[PDB]
Amino acid sequence: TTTATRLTGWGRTAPSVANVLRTPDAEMIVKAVARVAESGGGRGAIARGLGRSYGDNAQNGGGLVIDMTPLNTIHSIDADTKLVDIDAGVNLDQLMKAALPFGLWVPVLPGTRQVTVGGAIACDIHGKNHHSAGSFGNHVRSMDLLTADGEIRHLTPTGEDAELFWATVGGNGLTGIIMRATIEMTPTSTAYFIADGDVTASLDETIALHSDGSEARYTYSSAWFDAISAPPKLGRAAVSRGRLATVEQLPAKLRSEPLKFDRKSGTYRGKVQNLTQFYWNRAYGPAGFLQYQFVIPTEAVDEFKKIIGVIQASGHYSFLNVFKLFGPRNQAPLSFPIPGWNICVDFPIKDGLGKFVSELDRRVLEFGGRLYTAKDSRTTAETFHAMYPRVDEWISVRRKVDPLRVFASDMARRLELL
Ligand SMILES: Cc1cc2nc3c(=O)[nH]c(=O)nc-3n(C[C@H](O)[C@H](O)[C@H](O)COP(=O)(O)OP(=O)(O)OC[C@H]3O[C@@H](n4cnc5c(N)ncnc54)[C@H](O)[C@@H]3O)c2cc1C
Ligand SMILES: *N(O)c1cc(C(=O)N[C@H](C)c2ccccc2)cc(C(F)(F)F)c1
């Protein structure tokens, strides 16, 4: 029934071997969880989606991994309630294509659509529109969770099961297997964006642009960010901001099918873009690259500037940098986003990199920030627990729901969440 398999995250690092169950039969999945539970836990089980997480959260060395990608049925779409009811293995590209004709838009879109609904929930993913829409968790109306007791719990965000529900959002699969979920989509009349572009010349100017009050005028906003230039050109950014377009905003040619599927000069106004236009590690790493993401609380703006400073001075040079100001956070104890300054950098693997990122960890930690489980397989339990003050609250919920540790992963063991 299972296939022993070498697994890594997307950046192809920290491999381990697991027995992979890959079946479209939900009953086989229930059986397998039950079997692990009846062996008393053993080395446990974790779910896997499309493997786009860079870390070790979707692998389980010496244990069971359940590939959820064959559970990919879209059960219902409702344009009045805006609700879609889909299997957890459904991916966002497939969902985008299916929902567009109903005038529905996937409410949170990350940098790639090759992620499953299960993975979107388990990592509580965020997008270019976080400051207006929150993260993926905010839009989950209900979900079916297969728990350690072999039963499938129906969870809602305010029901009796609220606590389990919000430990599951951002829970990295460690409360059980999300089988199915109901997501509230965003209404739209077109599949296009209308975007305003701006360029800055300094880190301070980037920050002022995000603090002047104009962010509140766009539903989506992110920026490419210079991390190699010494000050004051350090932290200059190419900012892409916008909102979904109405039909009467489209070029006349595109009005026939508005819901169709698919420095210096970079200043513009009312440019009309499809998703691809508006929006290396796997190809070259991990002989090549270490991806690194963190968020610093809004009020700690100067501490943020300094970390940026430390990065440019490091001698570790990242071209691919993405910056964004996160909005308010949600109820999930282990959710990554907090309101604040968020950035992803991609470092070439070079001598002294490990020691340098350990120093970064310390700084993000002291300044009240955190790393993202979706981008990590290197940090320590001590660092992670410190970055997530609600971790003991979350661990308690997990103990109530999985007393025998039927659910387990490489990440759970490394970060002592098991
Ligand atoms: C090119 C690229 C761009 C990205 N951009 C963004 C971005 O803009 N914003 C962002 O937040 N993230 C981004 N990510 C990270 C990615 O969106 C998340 O890691 C996401 O969780 C991956 O989904 P997946 O289905 O591939 O999950 P996997 O990587 O397979 O698994 C991730 C976690 O989800 C759990 N999981 C998966 N399915 C289930 C299930 N059915 N039940 C319970 N748990 C489950 C796994 O156990 C694991 O803990 C990006 C990744 C890549 C490679
Ligand atoms: N980080 O603040 C951040 C990263 C992305 C993102 O899509 N990153 C992936 C790995 C990527 C980077 C560069 C080139 C290709 C892919 C997205 C955001 C968001 F805030 F959601 F816009 C933030």
Sequential DSSP letters for 340-353: EEEEEEEEEP-TTH
Three-state secondary-structure class, residue 19: strand
Domain total of the chain: 1
Residue identifier of the C-alpha nearest atom 6 of ligand 2: 111
Hunting for tokens 């050109």 — which residue is that?
233
CA of 80 to the centre of ligand 2 (A): 32
Resolution in Å, one decimal, please. 2.4
The answer, yes or no, to whether the previous bond of 348 is cis (omega within 30 of 0) is no
If we measure between CA atoms, which residue out of 8, 11, 7 comes closest to residue 281? Answer: 11
Q: What's the alpha-carbon Rg for the chain, to the nearest Å? A: 21
If we measure between CA atoms, which residue out of 184, 118, 185, 116 comes closest to residue 145? Answer: 118
Residues of the chain immediately before an interruption (C to N > 2.5 Å): 262, 279
Instruction: From 10, 72, 125, 320, give the residue whose CB has the most ligand 1 atoms within 8 Å, as the site to mutate.
Output: 125
Q: Is 368 annotated as a binding residue?
A: no
Distance CA 147, CA 166 (A): 14
Helical (H) or strand (E) element with 196: strand 193-199
Which amino acid is located at 197 in the chain? G
Q: Which atom of ligand 2 lies at the shortest distance from residue 320's CA?
A: 13
User: Measured from the CB, is residue 95 less than 6 Å from ligand 1?
Assistant: no
CA of 112 to the centre of ligand 2 (A): 9
Phi, psi (deg, nearest 5) at residue 406: -65, -35
Instruction: From 50, 322, 336, give the residue whose CB has the most ligand 2 atoms within 8 Å, as the site to mutate.
Output: 322
Three-state secondary-structure class, residue 178: strand
Q: What angle do CA 46, 47, 52 make, to 5 degrees?
A: 120
CA of 82 to the centre of ligand 1 (A): 24
User: Measured from the CB, is residue 293 less than 6 Å from ligand 1?
Assistant: no
For residue 350, give its domain range.
Answer: 1-418
Query: Closest ligand to 174 CA?
Result: 1
Distance CA 215, CA 116 (A): 29
In sequence order, what E strands does 245-313 have? 268-273, 289-297
Query: Closest ligand to 296 CA?
Result: 2
Residue identifier of the C-alpha nearest atom 37 of ligand 1: 119
Pocket of ligand 2 (CB under 6 A): 110-111, 126-128, 222, 293, 320, 322, 324, 342-344
In sequence order, what E strands does 302-365 have? 322-326, 340-348
Q: Which atom of ligand 1 lies at the shortest distance from residue 120's CA?
A: 21
CA of 322 to the centre of ligand 2 (A): 6
Collect all residues with Cβ–Cβ distance below 8 Å to 139 and sequence separation of at least 6: 107, 108, 133, 183, 184, 185
In sequence order, what E strands does 283-408 have? 289-297, 322-326, 340-348, 370-371
Distance CA 176, CA 258 (A): 40
Q: 201 to each of 172, 206, 225, 313, 342, how far by Cα in Å? A: 38, 8, 10, 18, 19
Hunting for tokens 């950014």 — which residue is that?
237
Strand order in the sheet with 74-77: 74-77, 83-87, 177-184, 140-146, 152-155
The answer, yes or no, to whether the previous bond of 232 is cis (omega within 30 of 0) is yes
Question: What sign has the CA pseudo-torsion 371, 376, 379, 382?
Answer: positive
